[PDB]
Each structure stands twice: as structure tokens, then as C-alpha cells.
């Protein structure tokens, strides 16, 4: 069992000091997936955005701390449900090996609370995507159940053949917002990707 | 308690088929051509890009066991090279989504083996499974089970609905998807379940 190197892989950089802060640009190590245009290139608070959150004791948004480290990385749209879907992505080092299973593992977060009058209850679902170039090989669309203010771990696994086309590949993970609901942000973390003998 | 949803033709076992390892290359009854990209023609013959269903029977050139449900399963071919888009079944139910309510849906994927006409039928070209309200795919299995030539597995799609999910009262929807990301480019589906129970 091999882990493969993914950089910024638990959000943790940049470290943020003060609770329930967050950056709204891309995270360090990722870019924006945006296949729909929704996140604009220059972003505030009242757009759509994503970054980096500090998940801390006072948190007013979760009922547990973030999964891994101090910080998850989040993805708010402010479009309507069905607008489209917006999210990360990270081309890796490796490639597309035979005779490989690969696991890529990561925790989804449902936002919880409530600011203001407004509350975060609600989920926009997800979609967590393992690539080799630009094929999608496998993918997790919103199967698990996560309640408000909760995270869970979303398994991804593939098998690569010796006659599969795209062997070689460079490797890839998404991690996508598909706005299907709100309240339409959610959270992401602990990536985690491994190879074994298949 | 657990509810079975009612699915049409939800083991392909109408038509009815006589002999063994023979197929049909025209839309199962009570399922439509999923065909977002137009890879499947109108009219097919055994040799275009097609689907239907086959009689998976004792003595099968192709499977290393029966169909999992029944005589027959469904099957997609597409002729197209991998990367040229996806095609399968749909079929819209007559149930709706439900306010917290959780959905499993079971459908069992089978991957070829054997030749047909020299032709090597080694290889798959990946699947997908989605449970569907209106036009929105709610929650999908894109081929995260690794099956073998000649033999079948069963894939698992689950959602639960809230009492805000936007498409609540929406028709729930089935499809079950070639993904044509490899050769040799068909797949077989089987014994489609859907049950619905209370969540919280
Ligand atoms: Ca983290
Ligand atoms: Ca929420
Ligand atoms: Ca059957
Ligand atoms: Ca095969």
C-alpha cells in the first residue's frame, strides 16, 4: 500500500489564525474547477467563492473540529440550484499504472448553524472524481448521507487494466460543488490517494 | 419499513428470448435510449452502435454464470472509439421524491467475455448507475467496481432526501450507462432494484 504524493492535500496551507476565518481564493496546490464559469476570477464575500477554512473550538458552523489538521477547504455558490457545478482540482505527479487499484478517499463537510437570521442547513451534494488526464475513471456523485454541521468519508476506488486506453496519464482529483440544493457550500478534506496490486 | 418501488421490464426479461447467447438489438421494452451524445442509431444492426437484451443461459459463450436475475439482461454496445461520448437505458418512474426518505437502488453490472464473430470481447469500457428526480442525476455509482471479463457485480446507489431538497414531488428516474472508456466497448446490466424507507 503506496500513498501518491498530492500537494495541500488537508487544506492546512495557509495556516489561519482566528476562528471560523477563511480565504476566498483558490487553495495553494489547487485551481478552481469551473466548468460553468460560476466563480469569478476576483471574488468577496458575496459571491461565490472558495478557500480555505479554520475549523476550531467556538466554531459556530460544525459539531466536531475539521477532519484533519486546523483548516478544510470549502466551495460556496451563490447561483440557483441547477446553474451548474464548481469545485477543485489537482493534476498529480503519477500517472495511470496496470494492475492498480487505486483508493482516493476524502471527507465531505455539511455546513451547519446558522449566522445572522440565515442558517447553513443544507447541502448542495457532491461529486468526488478520480482522473487520468481528462477522464473521469471513477467517481463517488453524492452517495453519502451528511447532516448538517457533520463530515463523512467519501471512498473512491479504481482498477486499472493493462489494456486500459489511458495508462500513462497523469493522475487527477476533483472535488466538486454540483449545486443541487442549498445551503449550497460544503466542505472537503483529508485527501487521501493509495495504489496497491491489483 | 423498506418499499419496493415498481420498475417496468426491470430484469430486461421481456421479450422473451428462445435460445441461448442470442440477443436483441432494439430498445428493451419499457426503457427508452439514453443517447445524450447520438452514438446509437434509430435503426441498428448487430454490427452498429445498439442495445437490447440477451439470453444468458446454461451453455453461455460469453459469462462465466447465469444472468443474475431470470433469462435475459440488458445490454449496451457502442461501436465508437472510447472517448466519443455515453449512451445507455432510462426509464422515468412513476414514484416521486420523498421528504426523508432514504433510496438504495441495486443494479447488477456484467462485463463480457468470450469472442463473438473473432471478434475479442475481453475488456470493458467502465459504467455508470444514477437515480435521477426530474432532469437532476441525485446520486450516481461512475464504475467504482472493478468487474472481470465474463463476470457480473452488483452496484449500490443510495440518497436520502431532506425535507428542502429542491426536487421533492420531481418523478424519480433510473439510468444505467456505457461510459465507452474502453474495449471492448459493451456492458450488461441486471435486476434493476429500487426501494425506498424513512430516514429520520
Ligand atoms: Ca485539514
Ligand atoms: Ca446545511
Ligand atoms: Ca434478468
Ligand atoms: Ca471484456
Do not use: C, M
Given at each position: 500500500?503506496?500513498?501518491?504524493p498530492?500537494?495541500?492535500a ?9 476562528v471560523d ?7 495553494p496546490?489547487?485551481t ?7 466563480v469569478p ?16 473550538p467556538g466554531?459556530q ?18 447561483q440557483?440550484?441547477?446553474?451548474g457545478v ?14 492498480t487499484?487505486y ?13 445572522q437570521?440565515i442558517s447553513?442547513?443544507?447541502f448542495?451534494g457532491?461529486?468526488?472524481e478520480?482522473?487520468?488526464?481528462d ?8 452517495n453519502?448521507?451528511?447532516?448538517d454541521?457533520?463530515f463523512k ?6 482498477t486499472?487494466?493493462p ?18 440544493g ?12 493509495t495504489?496497491?496490486?491489483?
Amino acid at each position: 500500500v503506496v500513498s501518491i504524493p498530492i500537494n495541500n492535500a488537508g487544506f492546512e496551507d495557509p495556516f489561519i489564525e482566528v476562528v471560523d476565518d477563511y480565504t476566498v481564493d483558490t487553495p495553494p496546490g489547487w485551481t478552481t474547477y469551473n466548468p460553468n464559469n460560476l466563480v469569478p476570477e476576483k471574488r468577496t464575500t458575496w459571491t461565490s467563492n472558495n478557500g480555505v477554512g479554520y475549523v476550531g473550538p467556538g466554531t459556530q458552523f460544525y459539531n466536531q473540529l475539521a477532519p484533519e489538521g486546523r483548516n478544510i477547504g470549502y466551495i460556496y455558490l451563490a447561483q440557483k440550484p441547477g446553474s451548474g457545478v464548481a469545485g477543485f482540482e489537482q493534476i498529480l505527479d503519477a500517472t495511470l499504472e496496470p494492475d492498480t487499484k487505486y483508493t482516493l478517499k476524502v471527507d465531505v463537510g455539511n455546513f451547519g448553524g446558522e449566522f445572522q437570521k440565515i442558517s447553513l442547513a443544507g447541502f448542495p451534494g457532491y461529486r468526488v472524481e478520480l482522473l487520468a488526464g481528462d477522464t473521469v475513471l471513477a467517481a463517488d456523485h453524492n452517495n453519502l448521507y451528511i447532516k448538517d454541521g457533520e463530515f463523512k468519508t467519501s471512498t473512491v476506488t479504481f482498477t486499472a487494466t493493462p489494456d486500459n486506453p489511458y495508462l500513462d496519464q497523469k493522475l487527477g482529483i476533483r472535488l466538486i460543488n454540483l449545486l443541487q440544493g442549498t445551503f449550497s457550500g460544503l466542505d472537503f478534506d483529508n485527501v487521501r490517494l493509495t495504489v496497491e496490486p491489483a
